[PDB]
Design a protein around this ligand. Structure first.
Ligand SMILES: Nc1ncnc2c1ncn2[C@@H]1O[C@H](COP(=O)(O)OP(=O)(O)NP(=O)(O)O)[C@@H](O)[C@H]1O
Ligand SMILES: Nc1ncnc2c1ncn2[C@@H]1O[C@H](COP(=O)(O)OP(=O)(O)NP(=O)(O)O)[C@@H](O)[C@H]1O
Ligand SMILES: [Mg+2]
Ligand SMILES: [Mg+2]
Lengths: 602, 711
């Protein structure tokens, strides 16, 4: 095991660290539950452990191999961050991906000092610090989500995003569930296979189910208000309308014969007794607030009916007061009867929302020509006639579908092409198709075979935060470092250009070394967009690397782009022709061509 | 079917596309299509009542303001109907553009109702702030100029004619309202505008000879009168904004220089955050407006610099007094619309009590600008006397609650109230009615002085911004700039305003000299050496100099700057059909077509996003066009060291280089600008500092030796 470990506790949560003497592997965790920390302690099974002198719960580490105690001064975050930065030779640890874990870094600082004391031999072999996560959801960094425009576009607007194309859900609860599914894509095949079977099964009956689902409305807010006992009289009537709607939905789903569809039908429930209580107890159109009165319906309580009669044909005003008090007590009693079934109702609201998201996904699939994706065991992506989900909808002109094949035999493709050729659209189409397959939706391609994807990494933007202290090359190099350090054989790494900030020679050199490292050692599935044609000579030298070229045809001054992926290198990017289309003055384009001839000639 | 439903339907017909909060009982309610739209936006339950079921949703009257805020933020216009006599009418229409209420509005942000009109000969844009009363007219003559005006103004509600041809810049904006073509006619606009200002002709304003702008202003004034359902006494002028009056900045330059919003989208680490420590909200909004539109009129700037110098010694005494005055401009707007609440009048009384202290402090300091502000603010002795006698020291939030009028303002009101406390229902009822009637009379007494009070609110806001800039100048060590007749920028010990404050490490100041003799400087330097900060410090110093503020440098001499152009970074908009090279090239084309000898052009790493030969060739041609033909003052940052030889070929171009020292394969950055050129970018060293794995950097260094050996 050869594993040295550290543990920390504070108000925010628990922090943990691991260091392997044999492999120089340094990792940190921030498990926020006592039980999770206990499971993590067993799963790590560390040879030695270090804990705070004032650790609150020693029971988690009560019996451990070579358990030891070190002082609080060693655990301080500011001292720990400086030592870690110096050991790795980095200004900040944002590149390693561990900068935002305060508790994890504090435990790591104690382990680094202890590790140096126990052996100075391992110290030169410690070069990185990474978080530990085998989370079911595919891991996506904040930058990848904004770059892929999963829910919010780069400007910050709701439109032109993947969620805008797929979010036509009838009910507000459904729209929230789809957005949550897009942000966390489940990697377990069994849950996705159940969702895909429901989407195909309910495809025929989407028109019958959606009107009834729209009537149900948002039940999540009504049920949460019921839990705090602040539900309005009108909100209880809304719940009664959904109870009346549930028999209709169940009858429609009964004809369908899919095990996932039938399970969702049972979870929805009928709640006939709750419907009977609400119908008898509440008037057809109840008032906005319970204070005025008239919420309770006659026949729910005999005494109330009698007091109401006395109130309406000064002593009579006292009888009116008695009636209002009896009514309010009956209303509080109504919450008491409904609340025992609150856990059951919460399961039903989730079941109704899942039906809305899946019925919506099925309608979107028929309208937009999507097809089911078939999962495979080894890490590879194959797409035939693939299209970008967002671009196809917003583009008046036709979309030209491009094929993709990635396997452990052909892991890296260097896409080279003319400017405005479609290289970035092709790389993003792979990322959105992989995420759409992994949420259980139907992919926008004729056929897709998607293998396990641990994490999706997107390096596209080049921006500088001067106040933060990082230039455009440092911001780009920080993202490249996170790709190289945190990448796995399963990861899909999409890199849109590298060395766009430095001189041509330094940039080509980093691009050549980063491309070699991703194919040779990381062995991740990589798509690399490049305007350096020197890198198109990499595929012959290194195995697993192939060249993909987008096609353009030049006639006179103007250029036409095919948008078609073919094998080859391109070797010419028509930058000056794209500049003239952008509107650069003719005299500037003419001078530029004259200089271009001189540079190539010598 | 029912008579009640028939009445709602007649009102709905008058206002078809806007949600109507019809008032039935103590609960505002919406019916039919409005009820469904309201339920989705306000999160209120929808219950159907048979007359043909009628969807009905309802909100309590006490909680109406909270619900109105949710719809106003979403951009919905909500007409509110109340039963005046049951006879009923739309008392007011609440729209994102024209909200004067405290809860609906944001304290340090301004909501502008704007109008766009496209005639065959160019575009006309008119903007009105209902609360401040400012009315500004413009005639943008290009699609690019119109887009810059829309982004800078950021209109809350934009009113566009149905026939507007270029519905591309307009599309995607907040609160878009389609208006009929008849509303934009010039003859109708001129008669309405002349009546509001009370002037026979608009020659005095100077807006008489602009036809397209006047058409947009006529629609804006008519919509504002209809939305508020009352005459707007606050609007009394129609100033015209011209391109010559202010330094022009495109939407991209405003974002790149981070004047008010950072590149991510937050307000943190922005020039406004460093310079804005204003005590009153009016000051915060005024300073933000000045930074967005710098003035090119030397007389206006020299007065602002003189005021900052005169009040610098007395800033500590003035700032506590100014804080008490608060947001007078918004309070006066509510008084003008006769919609004010008791707390607002108490805040007005507090500000008048502070004015004697401000007048005495300003009287001692001797400068022509400070004395003019002192004269404009005034004393308002009569109004303070009325407010102190009429209103209680701590009035209730609403007039109906009662207790708004203090004892002794009216003997009869005091007698009726005393009898009720000591028929009791009749005395209480009469007292509540009399207290409300007295409150309306107070508005009538305060309103004839509105013209003077509005002048005072502008003076107090100007003093707040100038005192804040003077306090900031002392704390951050800023010094006054001077102006020169011919185009040039000379800076000694200049430092970037935002980076200097945020960075704990010491800022190393740098000098810049740009003249017609040295029009262009090509900055070549080690990566992470400070080139972008050097270029942005020049733009921020030039903007700060032209807003009348002291500059962050030991000495600055700045000549006329027509426009500031910044090409920084690269971006992709796949949905729009714009590639990263296309977005960069359109920005480069805008600089080449629109640049003038007066303009300052800052360009960062132009020619990237394409092959090296195509990028260097386009960069050489663009540099040669800017230096030789446009002759603009420009700063160009390049890692292409081939472009470093431009000065030998062409006169008026010089090379400046930031420098770094390499030690043991590690990099130390001097951050000092020294004349000359740098032939090494130190890219591999910055990558190692970033955290690129050591094995990758070692292979990269091997490849770099091989590439340099090949050539
Ligand atoms: N497969 C496609 N079919 C149809 N249109 C496409 C396709 N791919 C791209 N386009 C269109 O062409 C535009 C340019 O593609 P894009 O990927 O942005 O080019 P680019 O190669 O990234 N340019 P650059 O980054 O400067 O090298 C897109 O915004 C689409 O409008
Ligand atoms: N004069 C200065 N004094 C101190 N620090 C400075 C100075 N100028 C820049 N910096 C620091 O430099 C960093 C950003 O450097 P930047 O201006 O982006 O360099 P650059 O040369 O443009 N980078 P690149 O575009 O990749 O070549 C920030 O941490 C600044 O605080
Ligand atoms: Mg691209
Ligand atoms: Mg830079």
């Amino acid at each position: 095991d050869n594993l040295l470990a550290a543990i920390w506790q504070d108000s925010k949560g628990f922090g943990y660290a691991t260091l392997d003497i044999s492999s120089g592997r340094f990792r940190l965790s921030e498990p926020a539950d006592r039980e999770t920390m206990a499971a993590e302690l067993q799963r790590t099974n560390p040879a030695e452990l270090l804990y705070a002198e004032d650790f609150a719960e020693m029971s988690l580490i009560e019996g451990r191999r070579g358990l030891r105690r070190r002082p609080l001064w060693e655990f301080e975050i500011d001292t720990a961050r400086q030592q870690l930065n110096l050991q790795f030779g980095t200004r900040d640890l944002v590149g390693f991906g561990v900068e935002n874990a305060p508790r994890g870094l504090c435990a790591a600082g104690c382990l680094l000092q202890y590790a140096k004391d126990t052996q100075r031999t391992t110290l030169p072999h410690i070069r990185s610090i990474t978080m530990e996560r085998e989370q079911d959801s595919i891991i996506m960094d904040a930058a990848t989500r904004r770059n892929l425009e999963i829910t919010q576009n780069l400007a910050g607007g709701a439109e032109n995003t993947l969620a805008s194309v797929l979010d036509c859900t009838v009910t507000p609860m459904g729209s929230r569930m789809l957005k949550r599914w897009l942000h966390m894509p489940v990697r377990d095949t069994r849950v996705l296979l159940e969702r895909q079977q429901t989407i195909g099964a309910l495809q025929d009956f989407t028109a019958g189910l959606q009107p009834v689902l729209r009537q149900v409305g948002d039940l999540e807010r009504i049920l949460a208000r019921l839990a705090l006992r602040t539900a309005r009289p009108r909100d209880l009537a809304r719940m009664r309308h959904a109870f009346q709607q549930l028999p209709e939905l169940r009858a429609q789903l009964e004809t369908v014969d899919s095990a996932p569809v039938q399970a969702l039908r049972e979870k929805m429930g009928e709640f006939a007794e709750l419907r009977d209580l609400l119908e008898r107890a509440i008037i057809d159109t109840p008032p906005v607030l319970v204070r005025d009165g008239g919420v309770i319906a006659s026949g729910y309580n005999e005494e109330l009916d009698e007091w109401r009669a006395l109130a309406d044909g000064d002593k009579v005003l006292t009888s009116k007061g008695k009636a209002l008090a009896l009514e309010k007590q009956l209303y509080e009693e109504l919450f008491d009867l409904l609340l025992p079934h609150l856990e059951a109702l919460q399961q039903s609201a989730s079941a109704l929302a899942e039906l809305d998201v899946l019925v919506n996904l099925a309608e979107r699939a028929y309208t937009l020509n999507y097809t089911c994706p078939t999962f495979i065991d080894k890490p590879g992506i194959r797409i035939t006639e693939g299209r970008h989900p967002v671009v196809e909808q917003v583009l008046n002109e036709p979309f030209i579908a491009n094929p993709l094949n990635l396997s452990p035999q052909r892991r890296m493709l260097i896409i080279t092409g003319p400017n405005m050729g479609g290289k970035s659209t092709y790389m993003r189409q792979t990322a959105l198709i992989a995420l759409m397959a992994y949420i259980g939706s139907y992919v926008p391609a004729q056929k897709v075979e998607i293998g396990p994807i641990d994490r999706i990494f997107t390096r596209v933007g080049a921006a500088d935060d001067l106040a933060s202290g990082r230039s455009t090359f440092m911001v780009e190099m920080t993202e490249t470092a996170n790709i190289l350090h945190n990448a796995t054989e399963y990861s899909l790494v999409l890199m849109d250009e590298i060395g766009r900030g430095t001189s041509t020679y330094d940039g080509l050199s980093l691009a050549w070394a980063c491309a070699e490292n991703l194919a040779n050692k990381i062995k991740a599935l990589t798509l690399f967009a490049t305007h350096y044609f020197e890198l198109t000579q990499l595929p012959e030298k290194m195995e697993g690397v192939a060249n993909v070229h987008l096609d353009a045809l030049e006639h006179g001054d103007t250029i036409a782009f095919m948008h078609s992926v073919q094998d080859g290198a391109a070797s010419k990017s028509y930058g000056l022709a794209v500049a003239a289309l952008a509107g650069v003055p003719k005299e500037v384009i003419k001078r530029a061509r004259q200089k271009l001839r001189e540079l190539e000639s010598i």
